[PDB]
Structure 1
Amino acid sequence: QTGGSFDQQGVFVKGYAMLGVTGQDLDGQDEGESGFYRTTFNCNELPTDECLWAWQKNQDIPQLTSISWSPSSQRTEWVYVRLGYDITQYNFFLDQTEGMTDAETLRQRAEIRFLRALHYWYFLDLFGKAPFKEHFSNDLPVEKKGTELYTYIQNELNEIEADMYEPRQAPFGRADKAANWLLRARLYLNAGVYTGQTDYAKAEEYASKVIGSAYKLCTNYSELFMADNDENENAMQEIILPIRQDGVKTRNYGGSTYLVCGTRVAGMPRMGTTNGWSCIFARAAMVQKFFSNLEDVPMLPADVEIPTKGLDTDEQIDAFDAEHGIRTEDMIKAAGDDRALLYSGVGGGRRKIQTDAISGFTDGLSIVKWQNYRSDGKPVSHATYPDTDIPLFRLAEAYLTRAEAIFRQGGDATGDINELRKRANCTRKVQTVTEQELIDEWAREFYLEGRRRSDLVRFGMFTTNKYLWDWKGGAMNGTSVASYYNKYPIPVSDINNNRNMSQNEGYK
């Protein structure tokens, strides 16, 4: 539908919706697996030191879990096709509005181009290249890779800035200048990876612009991931770009539902939902980001039995956990960090910190960072699907990005790192910053937010022996894998359909 049938406003809104909702066609793929969020999240989380997918029988899960996928990877095709599809939609909107000079359309085009740029970043970060097309048409996309792609995204962002909303002036959910600046800061931070030439001075500069804007850090970390993060100034003042989610109106199995339902199982107190999928749990390496010595991690003694009765309600579960100091609040206290939103209690069965074999959901601690509970205690909209928004872009990213840029430039990054540690009410403060502390802090601050893999690759820790974590590369204590795994392969299906695309080095 074009011309007189083109619903500009409607298509504009759908532009943003692709970030958090699945439409309504790949073979053997549940609709709930096609989302922009879920596919990119898995590609940047499942293979990392942050988490594990409990149901390994699911297609392509073992491959992603241990960094052993191939060009026939179903989950690689999923994110590749999803990213490409969203872009064709943006190109369509831009083509249909081309030539329109009214203030309204200009702003919409700026934001759409912002959204397209973000998508091209994922292509660049995940594949080092992307099936490029500036317009909507029949023509096969051409290949745009590395430096040229990097330069295109940067140029897009630089060109559309002037037309975007001032920081915190756009309707909640839409991207403003600070979102623009944050994306560029991320690009610059990883410029070394994408172009072979680092540019930390620029990453620092754009990070400072974001930090110097109206955005501010939420005083209660957990609130950023709660049901009312779209009706709480404390959380909203930090969320530069949210992915709206609603228990009744905006549902997505791969949306906040994925982060809440996917990390819970029946028996856990305060599930915030009626459905616990028991899918995502933390690896020992994740827990170690909060407990350098895993022996300090509050755990139930192995010689203590868990009653088969009397543990049916949250009240009973909590009381039992308190007796053994294993309530999440007890986990946070022992961790001396508000971000230690983990659970080792008996709700759902005995938990392990590390496992000799990936058997089930309880082989690692549970992650209760995402919640379908409002900080003000008010009712949520639905008993199953969460109202919780996904704060894709948070101000915290600017502090860690500037901190990393300063450190790599030979300066003192303690100031920026302690800004986040202070917010999380950390008992331990950083006296000096090391590469190790930085990558560890990136995990403590952003675990389960869909970016882990990218930070690891930048630190040369994703495939190498520089950092081995439980189950990395398929080995209990971790093992390395080929360096070509730092980039996902181009789906064989697209290699076959578009001769313009060349496979990434290393893959067959």
Structure 2
Amino acid sequence: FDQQGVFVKGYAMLGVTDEGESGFYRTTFNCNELPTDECLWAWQKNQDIPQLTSISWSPSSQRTEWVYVRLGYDITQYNFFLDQTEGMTDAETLRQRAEIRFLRALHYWYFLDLFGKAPFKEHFSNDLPVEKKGTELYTYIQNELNEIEADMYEPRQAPFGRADKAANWLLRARLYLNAGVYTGQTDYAKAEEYASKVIGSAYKLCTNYSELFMADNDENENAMQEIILPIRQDGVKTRNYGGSTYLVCGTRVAGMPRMGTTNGWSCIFARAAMVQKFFSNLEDVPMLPADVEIPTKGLDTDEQIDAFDAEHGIRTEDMIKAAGDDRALLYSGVGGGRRKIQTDAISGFTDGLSIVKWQNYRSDGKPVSHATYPDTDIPLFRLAEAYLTRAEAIFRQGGDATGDINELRKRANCTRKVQTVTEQELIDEWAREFYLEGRRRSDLVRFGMFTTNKYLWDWKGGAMNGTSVASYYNKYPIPVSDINNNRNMSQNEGYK
């Protein structure tokens, strides 16, 4: 038993691994992004993509089984480390157990949030996991975090990459924020409290939003000060087709300026509703006029591409100025072809605006380690979450959440201030702040907008302009394979 090595692998499971399809981050990300208003997967021919895209999957869903099997696998590995260090009481080992138990709690949260239940197992053995659902599961996760807190590093006192007390508190805030959904009983007071504990910690907001998703976010202090839990990635050493490689390569295509990589998969683009988050009137979106032809030559270098885009006011920096928000990191320029905002039929990558939020360029201008894979870390946990969580919690309780909302909009140099917080403004702010970070679905569900008519976005439910689906889709089904293999599990309501 190599305690040190197993400990390290526990964290590694977040960012390393069809293999490229079944990783931790990619599977959770897809279940929380592909069916939402933020994006679309360009190749609908890919297995189960249509299902996830329009919220029409079933118990035989391959992508549901992927995330399900992956989450459980990671936990079995955490259970192994825990059984091997059980009873030990030295300071460092306790700290290691707390961090591993934090990672397991995080995994159980995914189960709870995605399936509303989980195949529960506390130790590493061969027995069949037993089902732990709803309130029972919720309380288990909360208890774990409450117990391990004292054994963890103080905020920002842990080696970059490892989880500290704040990471602990932020997850608890998120759980409390969703208590109504998971236990049927809201607990917004607690959500506010723990959110305040994180805001009261050493962590601080990065003064430049984009820098949070750049190649040097693990060395740039301005970004690190806000990154509570990073999933380390590295162009040469830590590679994963489903890691940051997914977020950068998947969102680019040959022809785009400053791709940051040699391989543009042209897979992920934004839905019209995502663009609308920055432009209430989609007519305000900078776009190349229909009657202006795109040259077939002379648009090779970034300087040539930028020159054309600038002439027509369609460089990403032009998109940002038009949106009056630093977060509007979208591309409607010509590199890659004439783009559409909304499409009458999902036919390709250009049927929507490109998202260039993630970049494989360092804020300090220095070279990155590789030409194809990004160095960019995935800031899974960010301080900003605390502000949005406290803002929502305060709002729900009848208080005034304008101060917390403004803190984020001020950071993004927004020209439009939110005077009166409303449910609509809140869910739209979650989108603007965290889009393409793998959490959208969870928030939509909390707001009662994921499956209902309360909120319709393009291509929801499979309809061009969107439509509602059965309410039982607010939870993914337990893979039919686990049902037949583990008599202890029972399918979720609504499915067959």
Gaps of at least 5 residues in structure 1 are 1-5, 23-29
Deviations 1:431-467 (A, max 9, x none): 0000000000000000000000000000000000000
| Matched residue, 2:444 | 456
Question: Residues of 1 paired with 2:483 and 2:114: CA distance?
Answer: 16
Quick check: 302-311 or 413-422, which moved more? 302-311
Deviations 1:387-416 (A, max 9, x none): 000000000000000000000000100000
Deviations 1:216-239 (A, max 9, x none): 000000000000000000000000
Question: What is the match of residue 349 of structure 1?
Answer: 337
Aligned to 1:423: 411
Which residue of the partner structure matches residue 233 of structure 2?
A: 245
Q: Could you say which residue in structure 1 is the equivalent of 2:205? A: 217
Q: CA deviation at 1:100?
A: 1.1
| Superposed displacement of residue 102, structure 1 | 1.1
State how many pairs are aligned.
Answer: 496
How many angstroms apart in 2 are the aligned matches of 1:111 and 1:429?
Answer: 39
In the alignment, which residue of structure 2 is the partner of 1:256?
244
SS at match of 2:250: helix
2-structure distance, mates of 1:224, 1:475: 35
Q: Deviation at 1:103? A: 1.0
302-311 vs 289-298, which deviates more?
302-311
Looking at structure 2, the residues matched to 181 and 106 of structure 1 have their Cα atoms a distance apart, in angstroms, of 18
**Aligned residue in 2 for 1:499:** 487
Deviation digits for residues 166-186 of structure 1 (CA, Å, limit 9, x no counterpart): 000000000000000000000
Distance 1:474 1:408 in 2: 31
Structure 1 Cα separation of the partners of residues 447 and 101 of structure 2? 29
Q: Deviations over 1:79-101 (max 9, x none)?
A: 00000000000000000111111
**Any idea what the Cα deviations from partners look like across 1:138-191, whole Å, max 9, x if unmatched?**
100000000000000000000000000000000000000000000000000000
Structure 2: distance between partners of 1:11 and 1:308: 54
Name the TM-score, length of structure 1 as normaliser.
Answer: 0.97
Q: Which residue does 1:13 correspond to in 2? A: 8
* Mapped partners of 1:347, 1:50: distance in 2: 22
The separation in 1 between residues aligned to 2:157 and 2:45, in whole angstroms, is 46
Task: Return the offset for 1:261.
Answer: 0.2
Q: Deviations over 1:2-33 (max 9, x none)?
A: xxxx00000000000000000xxxxxxx2101
Distance 1:363 1:172 in 2: 39
Q: Once the 2 structures are TM-superposed, how far is the Cα of residue 207 of structure 1 from its aligned partner?
A: 0.1
- SS of residue in 2 equivalent to 1:161: helix
- Deviation of the 1:364 alpha carbon: 0.3
Distance 1:134 1:324 in 2: 59
Measured after TM superposition, the shift of residue 74 of structure 1 is: 0.1
Matched residue SS, 1:295? helix
How far did 1:344 drift?
0.1
Which aligned pairs between 1:313-462 and structure 2 lie closer than 5 A? 313-462=301-450
Give TM-score scaled by structure 2 length.
1.00
Cα offset for 1:315? Answer: 1.0
- 1:222-260 Cα offsets, whole Å, 9 max, x none, are 000000000000000000000000001100000000000
Alpha-carbon distance in 1 for matches of 2:325, 2:258: 21
Deviations 1:356-399 (A, max 9, x none): 00000000000000000000000000000000000000000000
Aligned-partner SS, 1:33: coil
How much has 1:266 moved relative to structure 2?
Answer: 0.1
SS in 1 for 2:381: strand
**Which SS does the other structure have where 1:31 is aligned?**
coil
SS at 1:426 equivalent: coil
Query: Tell me, which stretches of 5 or more residues in structure 2 are unaligned?
Result: none
In structure 2, distance between residues paired with 1:439 and 1:340: 16
1:185-227 per-residue CA deviation (whole Å, 9 max, x = no partner) reads 0000000000000000000000000000000000000000000
Q: Report deviation, 1:426.
A: 0.1
| CA–CA distance in structure 2, aligned partners of residues 428 and 251 of structure 1 | 39
Counterpart CA distance in 1 for 2:391 and 2:468 is 28
Cα distance in 1, alignment partners of residues 378 and 301 from structure 2: 29
Cα deviation per residue 1:248-305 (whole Å; 9 max; x = unaligned)? 1100000000000000000000000000000000000000000000000000001111
Measure the CA separation in 2 of the matches of 1:85 and 1:344.
40
Give CA-to-partner distance per residue, 1:44-88, whole Å, 9 cap, x none: 000000000001111100000000000000000000000000000
1 CA distance for matches of 2:478 and 2:135? 18
Write the distance in 1 (CA, Å) between the matches of 2:430 and 2:85.
40
Match of 2:466 among 456, 459, 478: 478
Quote how far apart the aligned CAs of 1:313 are.
1.5
The match for 1:120 is: 108
Cα shift readout 1:477-503 (whole Å, capped 9, x = no counterpart): 000000000000000000010000000
Query: In structure 1, the residue corresponding to 2:20 is in which secondary structure?
Result: helix
Deviation at 1:104, TM superposition (A): 1.2
Shift of 1:331: 0.1
The DSSP-based 3-state class of the residue aligned with 1:400 is: helix
- Quick one: distance in 1 between partners of 2:300 and 2:158? 46
Q: Give aligned-pair identity as a percent.
A: 100
Distance 2:193 2:12 in 1: 31
**How big is the shift at 1:312?**
1.4
Report the CA distance between 1:127 and its aligned residue.
Answer: 0.1
Tell me the distance in 1 between the aligned counterparts of 2:344 and 2:380. Answer: 34
